[PDB]
Amino acid sequence: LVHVASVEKGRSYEDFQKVYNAIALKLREDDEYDNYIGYGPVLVRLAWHISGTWDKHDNTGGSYGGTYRFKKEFNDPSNAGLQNGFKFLEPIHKEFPWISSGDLFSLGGVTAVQEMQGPKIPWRCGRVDTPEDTTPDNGRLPDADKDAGYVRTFFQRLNMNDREVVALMGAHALGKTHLKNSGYEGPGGAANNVFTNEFYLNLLNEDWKLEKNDANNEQWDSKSGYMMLPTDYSLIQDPKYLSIVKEYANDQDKFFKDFSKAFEKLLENGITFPKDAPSPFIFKTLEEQGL
Ligand code: HEM
Ligand SMILES: Nc1ccc(N)nc1
């Protein structure tokens, strides 16, 4: 099962920078969403969930085919809430109808990370929409009520190692859990629409108490009003994860560089890029363009 990247006909860096810019401008404009968190976090989660269906064993799922647009995947219980991200991107797709769905969803996540002052994430075009019957069944995205061994084994299916898993999880500084979406409630820190290494600092420095929420699920709560999922907290229960948590808590630049690599890899799993494919694009932020 081979998915070969195919550049949208005649398109180049400038075309994709325009799509970036439209996403970034709408991120700025539609600022009220989710009690003024804005759409950044949900777009990052959308990019991850459309990628996280991948299975290295047979190359099913993954970002390439854009299959989130089909009802089976759109209505995955694991994807509850992501409809808000898709609705955000609808006017973008209308303005730029030539971009593939997988390119749009993945570019949304890259744009969100960068516009929230995160690391640059190199991004490659050429995902191609595939038919409805290529949509992966529900149940490939991870549960949150589990322990470190679960997390480790889960991410092996995505070809991610301990350092890549701990780096990716730093995205949980962003946005919040919403009780009605996932059965968990609250943010992981204070700056939840700015991309920082706060997730690791909060894991190490807050006083965490294991409580039940209003959906009768356990989660870890701090008196500052932050929360951790059981799978988040597992990163300080397992000694191998804990060492990497401490590394990223103590080195912002290292976290940014490792996140950027892991997130690009996540968004590109399953895709074969021709030797003659364009190099990865690194988009300028609005701020860098004076826009
Ligand atoms: C063991 C792996 C993970 C689990 C179990 C997990 C679980 C969750 C859950 C339950 C939520 C709350 C959804 C809702 O109520 O709205 C959430 C939110 C989020 N997740 Fe994860 N996640 C995992 C990994 C990741 C990864 C790898 C990324 C991306 C690099 C990521 C990005 C996000 C973001 C940005 C949000 C906030 C969304 C919002 O505010 O709307 N997650 N995750
Ligand atoms: N989205 C999110 C926020 C906080 C935590 N701990 N996990 C996930």
mmCIF file of C-alpha atoms and ligand atoms in Angstrom:
data_model
loop_
_atom_site.group_PDB
_atom_site.id
_atom_site.type_symbol
_atom_site.label_atom_id
_atom_site.label_comp_id
_atom_site.label_asym_id
_atom_site.label_seq_id
_atom_site.Cartn_x
_atom_site.Cartn_y
_atom_site.Cartn_z
ATOM 1 C CA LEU A 1 0.000 0.000 0.000
ATOM 2 C CA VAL A 2 1.961 2.971 -1.319
ATOM 3 C CA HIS A 3 0.824 6.589 -1.236
ATOM 4 C CA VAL A 4 2.938 8.753 -3.517
ATOM 5 C CA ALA A 5 2.922 12.506 -2.922
ATOM 6 C CA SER A 6 1.650 14.373 -5.977
ATOM 7 C CA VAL A 7 2.016 18.153 -6.050
ATOM 8 C CA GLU A 8 -1.245 19.972 -6.756
ATOM 9 C CA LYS A 9 -0.921 20.878 -10.413
ATOM 10 C CA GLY A 10 1.366 23.826 -11.068
ATOM 11 C CA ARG A 11 1.522 24.866 -7.406
ATOM 12 C CA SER A 12 4.616 26.067 -5.558
ATOM 13 C CA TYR A 13 5.731 27.598 -2.255
ATOM 14 C CA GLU A 14 3.933 30.891 -2.833
ATOM 15 C CA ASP A 15 0.576 29.165 -3.361
ATOM 16 C CA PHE A 16 0.862 27.365 -0.039
ATOM 17 C CA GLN A 17 2.094 30.490 1.750
ATOM 18 C CA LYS A 18 -1.160 32.120 0.616
ATOM 19 C CA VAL A 19 -3.183 29.292 2.152
ATOM 20 C CA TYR A 20 -1.120 29.557 5.346
ATOM 21 C CA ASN A 21 -1.752 33.285 5.419
ATOM 22 C CA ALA A 22 -5.522 32.877 5.034
ATOM 23 C CA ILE A 23 -5.572 30.357 7.904
ATOM 24 C CA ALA A 24 -3.395 32.635 10.034
ATOM 25 C CA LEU A 25 -5.521 35.717 9.325
ATOM 26 C CA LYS A 26 -8.702 33.819 10.257
ATOM 27 C CA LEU A 27 -7.007 32.579 13.442
ATOM 28 C CA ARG A 28 -6.416 36.221 14.325
ATOM 29 C CA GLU A 29 -9.918 37.326 13.313
ATOM 30 C CA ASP A 30 -12.098 34.608 14.877
ATOM 31 C CA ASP A 31 -10.668 35.155 18.337
ATOM 32 C CA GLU A 32 -13.754 34.546 20.479
ATOM 33 C CA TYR A 33 -13.915 30.772 19.986
ATOM 34 C CA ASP A 34 -13.808 28.614 23.130
ATOM 35 C CA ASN A 35 -13.863 31.502 25.609
ATOM 36 C CA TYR A 36 -11.175 33.352 23.647
ATOM 37 C CA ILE A 37 -8.687 30.513 23.401
ATOM 38 C CA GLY A 38 -9.219 30.819 19.651
ATOM 39 C CA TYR A 39 -8.991 28.063 17.054
ATOM 40 C CA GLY A 40 -5.254 27.327 17.302
ATOM 41 C CA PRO A 41 -5.430 24.356 19.669
ATOM 42 C CA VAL A 42 -8.326 22.610 17.919
ATOM 43 C CA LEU A 43 -6.512 22.924 14.577
ATOM 44 C CA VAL A 44 -3.419 21.284 16.077
ATOM 45 C CA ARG A 45 -5.589 18.482 17.425
ATOM 46 C CA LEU A 46 -7.282 18.063 14.028
ATOM 47 C CA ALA A 47 -3.911 17.719 12.286
ATOM 48 C CA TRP A 48 -2.871 15.098 14.827
ATOM 49 C CA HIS A 49 -6.104 13.093 14.699
ATOM 50 C CA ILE A 50 -6.132 12.899 10.908
ATOM 51 C CA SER A 51 -2.547 11.630 11.060
ATOM 52 C CA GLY A 52 -2.860 9.420 14.138
ATOM 53 C CA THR A 53 -5.060 6.841 12.412
ATOM 54 C CA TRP A 54 -1.934 5.569 10.627
ATOM 55 C CA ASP A 55 -0.819 1.967 11.047
ATOM 56 C CA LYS A 56 2.818 1.310 10.120
ATOM 57 C CA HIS A 57 2.052 -2.378 9.561
ATOM 58 C CA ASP A 58 -0.085 -1.959 6.444
ATOM 59 C CA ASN A 59 0.008 1.787 5.744
ATOM 60 C CA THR A 60 -3.717 2.179 6.360
ATOM 61 C CA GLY A 61 -4.996 5.488 7.726
ATOM 62 C CA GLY A 62 -2.710 8.514 7.969
ATOM 63 C CA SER A 63 -2.997 12.071 6.672
ATOM 64 C CA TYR A 64 -2.579 11.294 2.966
ATOM 65 C CA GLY A 65 -6.120 10.457 1.916
ATOM 66 C CA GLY A 66 -7.963 13.272 3.690
ATOM 67 C CA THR A 67 -10.497 10.761 4.943
ATOM 68 C CA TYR A 68 -11.688 12.850 7.901
ATOM 69 C CA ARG A 69 -14.081 14.441 5.397
ATOM 70 C CA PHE A 70 -16.111 11.180 5.331
ATOM 71 C CA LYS A 71 -18.824 10.509 7.908
ATOM 72 C CA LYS A 72 -17.322 7.393 9.498
ATOM 73 C CA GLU A 73 -14.164 9.233 10.566
ATOM 74 C CA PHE A 74 -15.825 12.623 11.109
ATOM 75 C CA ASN A 75 -18.175 10.938 13.594
ATOM 76 C CA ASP A 76 -15.512 8.911 15.440
ATOM 77 C CA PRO A 77 -16.210 9.432 19.152
ATOM 78 C CA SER A 78 -12.465 10.087 19.493
ATOM 79 C CA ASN A 79 -12.866 13.085 17.193
ATOM 80 C CA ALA A 80 -15.670 14.818 19.112
ATOM 81 C CA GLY A 81 -15.071 18.569 18.952
ATOM 82 C CA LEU A 82 -12.908 18.525 15.835
ATOM 83 C CA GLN A 83 -15.940 19.525 13.767
ATOM 84 C CA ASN A 84 -15.163 23.048 14.988
ATOM 85 C CA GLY A 85 -11.777 22.897 13.290
ATOM 86 C CA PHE A 86 -13.266 21.521 10.084
ATOM 87 C CA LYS A 87 -15.865 24.303 10.032
ATOM 88 C CA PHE A 88 -13.091 26.866 10.524
ATOM 89 C CA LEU A 89 -11.262 25.479 7.503
ATOM 90 C CA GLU A 90 -14.355 25.372 5.271
ATOM 91 C CA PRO A 91 -14.069 28.967 3.992
ATOM 92 C CA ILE A 92 -10.344 28.412 3.496
ATOM 93 C CA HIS A 93 -11.034 25.408 1.276
ATOM 94 C CA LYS A 94 -13.674 27.400 -0.614
ATOM 95 C CA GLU A 95 -11.131 30.116 -1.393
ATOM 96 C CA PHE A 96 -8.433 27.591 -2.323
ATOM 97 C CA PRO A 97 -10.375 24.646 -3.745
ATOM 98 C CA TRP A 98 -7.268 23.193 -5.412
ATOM 99 C CA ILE A 99 -5.642 22.060 -2.158
ATOM 100 C CA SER A 100 -6.176 18.453 -1.117
ATOM 101 C CA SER A 101 -8.047 17.759 2.100
ATOM 102 C CA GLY A 102 -5.085 16.106 3.794
ATOM 103 C CA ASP A 103 -2.826 18.985 2.782
ATOM 104 C CA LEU A 104 -5.352 21.459 4.214
ATOM 105 C CA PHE A 105 -5.862 19.663 7.537
ATOM 106 C CA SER A 106 -2.141 19.135 8.094
ATOM 107 C CA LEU A 107 -1.277 22.699 7.033
ATOM 108 C CA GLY A 108 -3.882 23.954 9.497
ATOM 109 C CA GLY A 109 -1.938 22.362 12.334
ATOM 110 C CA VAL A 110 1.415 23.718 11.129
ATOM 111 C CA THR A 111 -0.055 27.207 10.758
ATOM 112 C CA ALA A 112 -1.582 27.064 14.233
ATOM 113 C CA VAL A 113 1.661 25.980 15.911
ATOM 114 C CA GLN A 114 3.675 28.704 14.198
ATOM 115 C CA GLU A 115 1.121 31.474 14.725
ATOM 116 C CA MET A 116 0.954 30.558 18.424
ATOM 117 C CA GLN A 117 4.710 31.336 18.560
ATOM 118 C CA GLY A 118 5.762 27.690 18.360
ATOM 119 C CA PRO A 119 8.669 26.291 16.353
ATOM 120 C CA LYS A 120 8.794 26.385 12.578
ATOM 121 C CA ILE A 121 7.416 23.090 11.225
ATOM 122 C CA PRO A 122 8.648 22.209 7.731
ATOM 123 C CA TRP A 123 5.680 21.011 5.675
ATOM 124 C CA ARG A 124 5.419 19.081 2.412
ATOM 125 C CA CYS A 125 2.552 19.172 -0.063
ATOM 126 C CA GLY A 126 1.138 16.412 -2.190
ATOM 127 C CA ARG A 127 -1.368 14.415 -0.134
ATOM 128 C CA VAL A 128 -4.105 13.166 -2.498
ATOM 129 C CA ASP A 129 -7.756 12.623 -1.566
ATOM 130 C CA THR A 130 -8.683 8.929 -1.564
ATOM 131 C CA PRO A 131 -12.186 7.410 -1.751
ATOM 132 C CA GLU A 132 -14.628 6.835 1.083
ATOM 133 C CA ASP A 133 -13.831 3.145 1.355
ATOM 134 C CA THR A 134 -10.226 3.985 2.333
ATOM 135 C CA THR A 135 -11.431 5.645 5.538
ATOM 136 C CA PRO A 136 -10.060 3.881 8.612
ATOM 137 C CA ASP A 137 -12.492 2.380 11.127
ATOM 138 C CA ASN A 138 -12.972 4.164 14.452
ATOM 139 C CA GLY A 139 -10.802 3.085 17.370
ATOM 140 C CA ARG A 140 -7.261 3.848 16.183
ATOM 141 C CA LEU A 141 -6.802 6.974 18.318
ATOM 142 C CA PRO A 142 -5.623 6.643 21.911
ATOM 143 C CA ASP A 143 -7.575 6.378 25.160
ATOM 144 C CA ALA A 144 -6.739 8.849 27.940
ATOM 145 C CA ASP A 145 -7.542 6.688 30.981
ATOM 146 C CA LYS A 146 -4.451 4.451 30.668
ATOM 147 C CA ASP A 147 -0.857 4.220 31.908
ATOM 148 C CA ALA A 148 2.662 4.711 30.559
ATOM 149 C CA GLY A 149 2.944 1.206 29.145
ATOM 150 C CA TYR A 150 -0.253 1.765 27.172
ATOM 151 C CA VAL A 151 1.089 5.059 25.801
ATOM 152 C CA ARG A 152 4.405 3.478 24.827
ATOM 153 C CA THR A 153 2.830 0.537 23.018
ATOM 154 C CA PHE A 154 0.191 2.726 21.362
ATOM 155 C CA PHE A 155 2.778 5.007 19.797
ATOM 156 C CA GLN A 156 4.843 2.120 18.440
ATOM 157 C CA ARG A 157 2.076 1.717 15.853
ATOM 158 C CA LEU A 158 2.892 5.276 14.697
ATOM 159 C CA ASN A 159 6.635 4.505 14.697
ATOM 160 C CA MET A 160 7.272 6.944 17.561
ATOM 161 C CA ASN A 161 9.890 6.344 20.267
ATOM 162 C CA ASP A 162 9.974 7.619 23.863
ATOM 163 C CA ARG A 163 11.507 10.996 23.004
ATOM 164 C CA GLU A 164 9.074 11.552 20.128
ATOM 165 C CA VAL A 165 6.090 10.656 22.324
ATOM 166 C CA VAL A 166 7.124 12.961 25.150
ATOM 167 C CA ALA A 167 7.841 15.786 22.684
ATOM 168 C CA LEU A 168 4.497 15.401 20.934
ATOM 169 C CA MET A 169 2.627 15.409 24.246
ATOM 170 C CA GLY A 170 3.911 18.928 24.936
ATOM 171 C CA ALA A 171 1.074 20.076 22.669
ATOM 172 C CA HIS A 172 -1.145 19.470 25.716
ATOM 173 C CA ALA A 173 -0.097 22.907 26.941
ATOM 174 C CA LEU A 174 -2.577 24.057 24.289
ATOM 175 C CA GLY A 175 -6.326 24.477 24.580
ATOM 176 C CA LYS A 176 -8.247 22.403 27.097
ATOM 177 C CA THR A 177 -10.198 19.231 27.728
ATOM 178 C CA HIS A 178 -13.961 19.728 27.404
ATOM 179 C CA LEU A 179 -16.253 17.474 29.460
ATOM 180 C CA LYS A 180 -18.836 17.133 26.686
ATOM 181 C CA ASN A 181 -16.240 16.086 24.089
ATOM 182 C CA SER A 182 -14.047 13.637 25.965
ATOM 183 C CA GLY A 183 -15.259 13.228 29.560
ATOM 184 C CA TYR A 184 -12.353 15.343 30.900
ATOM 185 C CA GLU A 185 -12.398 19.029 31.870
ATOM 186 C CA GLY A 186 -9.858 21.840 32.125
ATOM 187 C CA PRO A 187 -6.650 23.387 30.745
ATOM 188 C CA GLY A 188 -3.092 22.156 31.304
ATOM 189 C CA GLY A 189 -1.645 25.555 32.161
ATOM 190 C CA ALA A 190 -2.032 29.328 32.009
ATOM 191 C CA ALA A 191 -0.855 30.087 28.475
ATOM 192 C CA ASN A 192 -3.019 27.770 26.458
ATOM 193 C CA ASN A 193 -2.990 29.570 23.133
ATOM 194 C CA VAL A 194 0.769 30.219 23.162
ATOM 195 C CA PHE A 195 3.077 27.321 22.297
ATOM 196 C CA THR A 196 5.614 26.866 25.120
ATOM 197 C CA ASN A 197 7.135 24.075 27.226
ATOM 198 C CA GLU A 198 4.693 24.805 30.075
ATOM 199 C CA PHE A 199 3.253 21.266 29.976
ATOM 200 C CA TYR A 200 6.502 19.832 31.333
ATOM 201 C CA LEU A 201 7.027 22.583 33.889
ATOM 202 C CA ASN A 202 3.500 22.101 35.193
ATOM 203 C CA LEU A 203 3.869 18.306 35.395
ATOM 204 C CA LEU A 204 6.982 18.772 37.529
ATOM 205 C CA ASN A 205 6.076 21.816 39.607
ATOM 206 C CA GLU A 206 2.356 21.676 40.383
ATOM 207 C CA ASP A 207 0.829 19.847 43.338
ATOM 208 C CA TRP A 208 -1.330 17.247 41.616
ATOM 209 C CA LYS A 209 -4.282 15.515 43.226
ATOM 210 C CA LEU A 210 -6.141 12.573 41.709
ATOM 211 C CA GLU A 211 -9.812 13.598 41.614
ATOM 212 C CA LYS A 212 -13.005 12.620 39.852
ATOM 213 C CA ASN A 213 -14.631 15.031 37.422
ATOM 214 C CA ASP A 214 -18.330 15.570 36.766
ATOM 215 C CA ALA A 215 -18.314 12.714 34.238
ATOM 216 C CA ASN A 216 -17.102 10.288 36.937
ATOM 217 C CA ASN A 217 -13.657 9.919 35.339
ATOM 218 C CA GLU A 218 -10.373 10.339 37.217
ATOM 219 C CA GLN A 219 -8.023 13.168 36.283
ATOM 220 C CA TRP A 220 -5.141 14.963 38.026
ATOM 221 C CA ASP A 221 -5.974 18.477 39.234
ATOM 222 C CA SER A 222 -3.838 21.275 40.659
ATOM 223 C CA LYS A 223 -4.887 24.141 42.897
ATOM 224 C CA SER A 224 -3.846 26.534 40.121
ATOM 225 C CA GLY A 225 -6.802 25.157 38.152
ATOM 226 C CA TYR A 226 -4.784 22.994 35.766
ATOM 227 C CA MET A 227 -5.405 19.345 34.893
ATOM 228 C CA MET A 228 -3.550 16.339 33.512
ATOM 229 C CA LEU A 229 -5.062 13.293 31.826
ATOM 230 C CA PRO A 230 -4.017 9.953 33.315
ATOM 231 C CA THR A 231 -1.925 9.419 30.169
ATOM 232 C CA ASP A 232 -0.298 12.841 30.634
ATOM 233 C CA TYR A 233 0.546 12.151 34.277
ATOM 234 C CA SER A 234 1.980 8.788 33.220
ATOM 235 C CA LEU A 235 4.917 10.694 31.731
ATOM 236 C CA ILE A 236 6.166 11.418 35.238
ATOM 237 C CA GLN A 237 5.285 7.957 36.628
ATOM 238 C CA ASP A 238 7.522 6.098 34.164
ATOM 239 C CA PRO A 239 11.232 6.697 34.822
ATOM 240 C CA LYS A 240 12.204 6.838 31.136
ATOM 241 C CA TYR A 241 9.509 9.359 30.280
ATOM 242 C CA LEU A 242 10.319 11.367 33.422
ATOM 243 C CA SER A 243 13.916 12.002 32.356
ATOM 244 C CA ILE A 244 12.715 13.425 29.034
ATOM 245 C CA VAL A 245 10.045 15.519 30.742
ATOM 246 C CA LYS A 246 12.829 17.056 32.866
ATOM 247 C CA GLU A 247 14.934 17.688 29.766
ATOM 248 C CA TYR A 248 12.173 19.619 28.006
ATOM 249 C CA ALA A 249 11.192 21.481 31.192
ATOM 250 C CA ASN A 250 14.801 22.698 31.311
ATOM 251 C CA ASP A 251 15.462 23.454 27.629
ATOM 252 C CA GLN A 252 12.854 25.352 25.604
ATOM 253 C CA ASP A 253 14.901 25.274 22.409
ATOM 254 C CA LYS A 254 15.444 21.512 22.582
ATOM 255 C CA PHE A 255 11.708 20.945 23.064
ATOM 256 C CA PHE A 256 10.944 23.194 20.085
ATOM 257 C CA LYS A 257 13.408 21.375 17.826
ATOM 258 C CA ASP A 258 12.285 17.890 18.871
ATOM 259 C CA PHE A 259 8.592 18.791 18.659
ATOM 260 C CA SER A 260 9.080 20.216 15.169
ATOM 261 C CA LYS A 261 10.718 17.004 13.929
ATOM 262 C CA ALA A 262 8.184 14.693 15.585
ATOM 263 C CA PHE A 263 5.188 16.715 14.404
ATOM 264 C CA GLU A 264 6.408 16.836 10.812
ATOM 265 C CA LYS A 265 7.040 13.092 10.971
ATOM 266 C CA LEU A 266 3.553 12.468 12.361
ATOM 267 C CA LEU A 267 1.998 14.520 9.558
ATOM 268 C CA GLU A 268 4.067 12.690 6.910
ATOM 269 C CA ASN A 269 3.754 9.078 8.124
ATOM 270 C CA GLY A 270 2.520 6.861 5.310
ATOM 271 C CA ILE A 271 3.607 9.152 2.460
ATOM 272 C CA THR A 272 6.266 8.362 -0.144
ATOM 273 C CA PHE A 273 7.939 11.482 -1.501
ATOM 274 C CA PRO A 274 9.537 11.159 -4.942
ATOM 275 C CA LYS A 275 13.268 11.915 -5.044
ATOM 276 C CA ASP A 276 12.362 14.862 -7.296
ATOM 277 C CA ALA A 277 9.667 16.211 -4.958
ATOM 278 C CA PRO A 278 10.041 19.821 -3.781
ATOM 279 C CA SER A 279 11.957 20.264 -0.547
ATOM 280 C CA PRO A 280 9.854 20.888 2.559
ATOM 281 C CA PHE A 281 8.414 24.400 2.792
ATOM 282 C CA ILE A 282 9.043 26.607 5.815
ATOM 283 C CA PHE A 283 6.288 29.218 5.927
ATOM 284 C CA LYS A 284 6.794 32.742 7.212
ATOM 285 C CA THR A 285 4.470 33.793 10.013
ATOM 286 C CA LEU A 286 2.184 36.781 9.556
ATOM 287 C CA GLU A 287 4.462 38.681 11.947
ATOM 288 C CA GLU A 288 7.545 37.881 9.858
ATOM 289 C CA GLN A 289 5.724 39.174 6.755
ATOM 290 C CA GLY A 290 4.514 42.384 8.434
ATOM 291 C CA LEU A 291 0.910 41.228 7.936
HETATM 292 C C1 HEM B 1 -1.716 9.424 24.548
HETATM 293 C C2 HEM B 1 -1.994 10.446 23.566
HETATM 294 C C3 HEM B 1 -2.997 11.431 23.688
HETATM 295 C C4 HEM B 1 -4.225 11.342 24.332
HETATM 296 C C5 HEM B 1 -4.881 10.179 25.063
HETATM 297 C C6 HEM B 1 -4.849 12.572 24.092
HETATM 298 C C7 HEM B 1 -6.125 12.928 24.582
HETATM 299 C C8 HEM B 1 -6.736 14.189 24.512
HETATM 300 C C9 HEM B 1 -7.967 14.487 25.064
HETATM 301 C C10 HEM B 1 -8.892 13.548 25.826
HETATM 302 C C11 HEM B 1 -8.180 15.835 24.776
HETATM 303 C C12 HEM B 1 -9.461 16.643 25.059
HETATM 304 C C13 HEM B 1 -10.402 16.693 23.862
HETATM 305 C C14 HEM B 1 -11.643 17.539 24.216
HETATM 306 O O1 HEM B 1 -12.256 17.300 25.258
HETATM 307 O O2 HEM B 1 -11.882 18.565 23.583
HETATM 308 C C15 HEM B 1 -7.102 16.270 24.026
HETATM 309 C C16 HEM B 1 -6.916 17.598 23.545
HETATM 310 C C17 HEM B 1 -5.856 18.064 22.748
HETATM 311 N N1 HEM B 1 -4.866 17.284 22.277
HETATM 312 FE FE1 HEM B 1 -4.456 15.347 22.851
HETATM 313 N N2 HEM B 1 -4.115 13.349 23.296
HETATM 314 C C18 HEM B 1 -2.997 12.672 23.047
HETATM 315 C C19 HEM B 1 -1.964 13.185 22.257
HETATM 316 C C20 HEM B 1 -1.903 14.394 21.535
HETATM 317 C C21 HEM B 1 -0.925 14.696 20.594
HETATM 318 C C22 HEM B 1 0.179 13.744 20.119
HETATM 319 C C23 HEM B 1 -1.227 15.992 20.152
HETATM 320 C C24 HEM B 1 -0.616 16.764 19.155
HETATM 321 C C25 HEM B 1 0.805 16.905 18.934
HETATM 322 C C26 HEM B 1 -2.344 16.396 20.879
HETATM 323 C C27 HEM B 1 -2.983 17.642 20.815
HETATM 324 C C28 HEM B 1 -4.091 18.085 21.537
HETATM 325 C C29 HEM B 1 -4.547 19.400 21.540
HETATM 326 C C30 HEM B 1 -3.878 20.604 20.904
HETATM 327 C C31 HEM B 1 -5.690 19.393 22.329
HETATM 328 C C32 HEM B 1 -6.565 20.610 22.686
HETATM 329 C C33 HEM B 1 -7.782 20.739 21.739
HETATM 330 C C34 HEM B 1 -8.787 21.844 22.094
HETATM 331 O O3 HEM B 1 -8.485 22.649 22.960
HETATM 332 O O4 HEM B 1 -9.807 21.951 21.422
HETATM 333 N N3 HEM B 1 -2.804 15.378 21.640
HETATM 334 N N4 HEM B 1 -6.232 15.252 23.852
HETATM 335 N N1 LIG B 2 -5.778 19.670 25.872
HETATM 336 C C1 LIG B 2 -5.205 19.287 27.041
HETATM 337 C C2 LIG B 2 -5.031 20.189 28.097
HETATM 338 C C3 LIG B 2 -4.435 19.748 29.282
HETATM 339 C C4 LIG B 2 -4.018 18.419 29.405
HETATM 340 N N2 LIG B 2 -3.440 17.972 30.540
HETATM 341 N N3 LIG B 2 -4.192 17.561 28.376
HETATM 342 C C5 LIG B 2 -4.770 17.972 27.218
#
